[PDB]
Design a protein around this ligand. Structure first.
Ligand SMILES: [Ag+]
Ligand SMILES: [Ag+]
Ligand SMILES: [Cu+2]
Ligand SMILES: [Cu+2]
Ligand SMILES: [Cu+2]
Ligand SMILES: [Cu+2]
Ligand SMILES: [Cu+2]
Ligand SMILES: [Cu+2]
Ligand SMILES: [Cu+2]
Lengths: 462, 460
């Protein structure tokens, strides 16, 4: 009788003092919302042009009154944005909100601070900005969300997040579900607390160690079910919550195989029955429903709470099988002239800090040359009252070398931008920035990021 | 119209104007904020702790209203500063959000002491500032200044009066007994929601937020017990947008003695006085013609704000002198261009010189100790608002309005001027200290919407 998850059972959120259990909503079960693929304004093989518009509106979530929500090219979350490697991407960023926002491309190898779209890329109500870039990184699932400093939390809670899919030649060649909306779906995992008139009140539910409500919400849907019409289904899991951790497993321990992480395909497929994700992490998995019959419903659960029902229909057999090797991880060579960087995440509540300091806009906390790989030792110092801190770094994809001198977890051998650090643990990352800019590095529990557990590094060309 | 401003441009002609309505709530004594007791005070030094905190205040019957304040649940204890005295303040933030501590109208360095956009104080942390004011006696105030949102934080209730004492003002025949005959009159409005709670974002409007319930020193339907013949009222417009058009029953006269940055050169009689956001005006009222039990109401437009209950009082036979203060105007540096500042737009198109505020961008420079002319224009006409233009880290003089005389109460030092639609005012502006100072419209929703720039001052 042990935990089924890789992380440290005592550190789990369910052990927190102000832990909010998930509760099942009485709302009607309804089809999972699959956000439309965002149609480009114009597209050639060399160039793509998109308009992305932050906007306030209303969404039917619970029965009765509609919930006031924000979203991208929609009233909640966003239309899914497809980018291609090597394709000159051109984006118009339009803000029609009553408040100034930011357009952060979490996981995008792009310049900073302006394209990156973090704390220093404000966009006022009414005005537009124009960005352009060519991603040179592997196929993966990234995402877009707001990133004012503060409050990233409030804006994400309002509903500013959208899945971003990055396509490439290698990933296209592999035998994988790719029919978006049919056998390949977003699974954006969030929670909310609904107040009177089914409205949200971030500030009423504020907690300095993380905001979480009882009602799970997947792709802006309550009590979702999904209609399976293929044997294999591809799930792109994104933890878009402000603090909650998802411990994912089917009711009957139905196996699934993870094929992707944050920043790339995994080098090899990894079989799971139980998958934990901290804030901002992604995991792409293939589920096989071949043992089931028409009419059966297999339910996906987080801990002991049902999240997502899969209604099984008729499907043609799928004989295909995954290769031993999905992707070639080309590790950089550490620059020997560089020392080891030590980053200590510390404190809790309003005490949060990185290397003894709260985030300041005008202060540069670190530098690193472009093109030069470096070992980062990252430490979560919190003691017994412990929390798994998802450490994130803008403008790169790192490799995970060790966890307390031991091997990294079996699903951490590919490229990642976010790694959960257990209380007391030091992890070692191999980090390289390709481009010049100012990039944030922070805990992706968003309430702590708004509270000062954020710092910034400047990359430069020698 | 009895007021100096342009009647067509008044707020009550605005598109989504919100008229004040009188609350059904019972009459009660005007809250007079206590004077903040120093930690330690000598003749050369003073040491304060200012704590921004969150709590609950009984404002209407039923549930309490969740508010913010400095060293209290709502607004703040009145802070006293002396010219030439080394002041030592400790800023403590116990709010669940980050904030700022701006000393509106204080000649202090920027950008840290100024406490503008660049001076964040996180939850749980403390900062330490020290300074010495070399400016005349007047009424300043303290309030939150994150960029953004100043408007949200001021709404929550973060404002407090600040009194600057000096030797000249002490020597004058003025009511000076705080809370007895020398009172704050902090003029605000609010909209009360279910369970008497405020909700800024529900009430939001890009052209300014106004609610229908007047609130004076965090009091609803206040009355004040007059126990002297003369009473000094320190008017402060702490509203987000609303203009106050002040007058008494019977058209009882009052005398303005001071404005934002100084006593007026001479006293100015009024029956009707108008104030835009962030303006302060100090007036003496005389109730010598009234008797035991008489009530005199102070109105904005047709709406009662404050009831003065006259009691028996000793006759006060003192008259004010012809001259209150000497205004020593700096001379323009002749080698220096006229600075043209244009406030444009309304709603989401608010801008200054065609640009929205960028926290990394310096829009202007000026040498310390050299007075320059500032021509400030308000472009919007037809749908027009009186824009109260404000400059950090200085006290300017008003030279002209559209090439004509300034208003009768603009011959003193000021930090905030109401500019009518289409109007160019000329200011004479000098900066004593080096720093980075914001200048902006003080209709706060425009401030937050980007009608703001920043100037940098340097030693030549
Ligand atoms: Ag904790
Ligand atoms: Ag208007
Ligand atoms: Cu992110
Ligand atoms: Cu990011
Ligand atoms: Cu970030
Ligand atoms: Cu101010
Ligand atoms: Cu100011
Ligand atoms: Cu304005
Ligand atoms: Cu200001």
């Amino acid at each position: 009788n042990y935990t089924d998850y890789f992380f440290d059972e005592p550190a789990f959120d369910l052990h927190d003092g102000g832990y909010v259990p998930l509760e099942v909503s009485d709302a009607p079960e309804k089809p999972l919302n699959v956000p439309p693929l965002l149609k480009p304004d114009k597209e050639t093989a060399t160039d793509v042009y998109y308009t992305v518009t932050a906007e306030a509106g209303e969404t039917q979530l619970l029965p009765g009154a509609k919930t006031k929500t924000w979203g991208y090219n929609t009233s909640l979350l966003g239309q899914t944005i497809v980018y291609r490697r090597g394709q000159h991407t051109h984006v118009t960023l339009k803000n029609t909100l009553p408040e100034l926002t930011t357009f952060h491309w979490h996981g995008a190898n792009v310049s900073g601070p302006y394209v990156d779209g973090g704390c220093h890329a404000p966009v006022y109500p009414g005005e537009s900005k124009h960005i352009d870039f060519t991603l040179e990184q592997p196929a993966t699932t990234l995402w877009l969300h707001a990133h004012p400093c503060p409050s990233t939390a409030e804006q994400v809670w309002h509903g500013l997040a959208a899945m971003v899919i990055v396509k490439d030649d290698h990933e296209a060649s592999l035998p994988l579900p790719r029919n978006y909306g049919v056998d390949d779906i977003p699974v954006i995992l969030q929670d909310r607390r609904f107040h009177e008139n089914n409205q949200w009140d971030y500030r009423a539910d504020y907690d300095p160690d993380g905001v979480a409500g009882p009602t799970a919400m997947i792709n802006g849907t309550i009590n979702p079910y999904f209609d399976v019409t293929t044997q294999k289904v591809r799930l792109r899991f994104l933890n878009g919550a402000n603090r909650r951790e998802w411990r994912l497993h089917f009711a009957d321990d139905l196996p699934f195989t993870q094929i992707g992480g944050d920043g790339s395909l995994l080098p090899e497929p990894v079989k799971f029955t139980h998958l934990m994700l901290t804030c901002a992490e992604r995991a792409e998995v293939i589920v096989d429903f071949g043992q089931y019959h028409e009419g059966d419903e297999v339910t996906l659960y987080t801990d002991d709470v049902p999240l997502l029902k899969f209604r099984i229909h008729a499907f043609k057999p799928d004989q295909t099988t995954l290769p031993d090797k999905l992707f070639d991880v080309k590790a950089p060579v550490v620059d020997p002239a560089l020392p080891v960087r030590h980053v200590v995440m510390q404190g809790m509540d309003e005490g949060v800090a990185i290397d003894g300091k709260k985030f300041a806009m005008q202060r540069i906390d670190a530098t690193q040359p472009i093109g030069k790989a470096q070992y980062w030792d990252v430490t979560n110092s919190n003691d017994a009252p412990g929390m798994v801190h998802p450490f994130h770094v803008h403008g790169t994809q790192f490799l995970v070398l060790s966890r307390n001198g031991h091997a990294p977890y079996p699903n951490e051998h590919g490229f990642k931008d976010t790694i959960g650090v257990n209380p007391g643990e030091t992890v070692r990352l191999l980090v390289r920035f390709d481009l010049p800019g100012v990039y944030m590095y922070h805990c992706h529990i968003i309430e702590h990021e708004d509270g000062g557990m954020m710092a910034q590094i400047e990359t430069f060309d020698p």
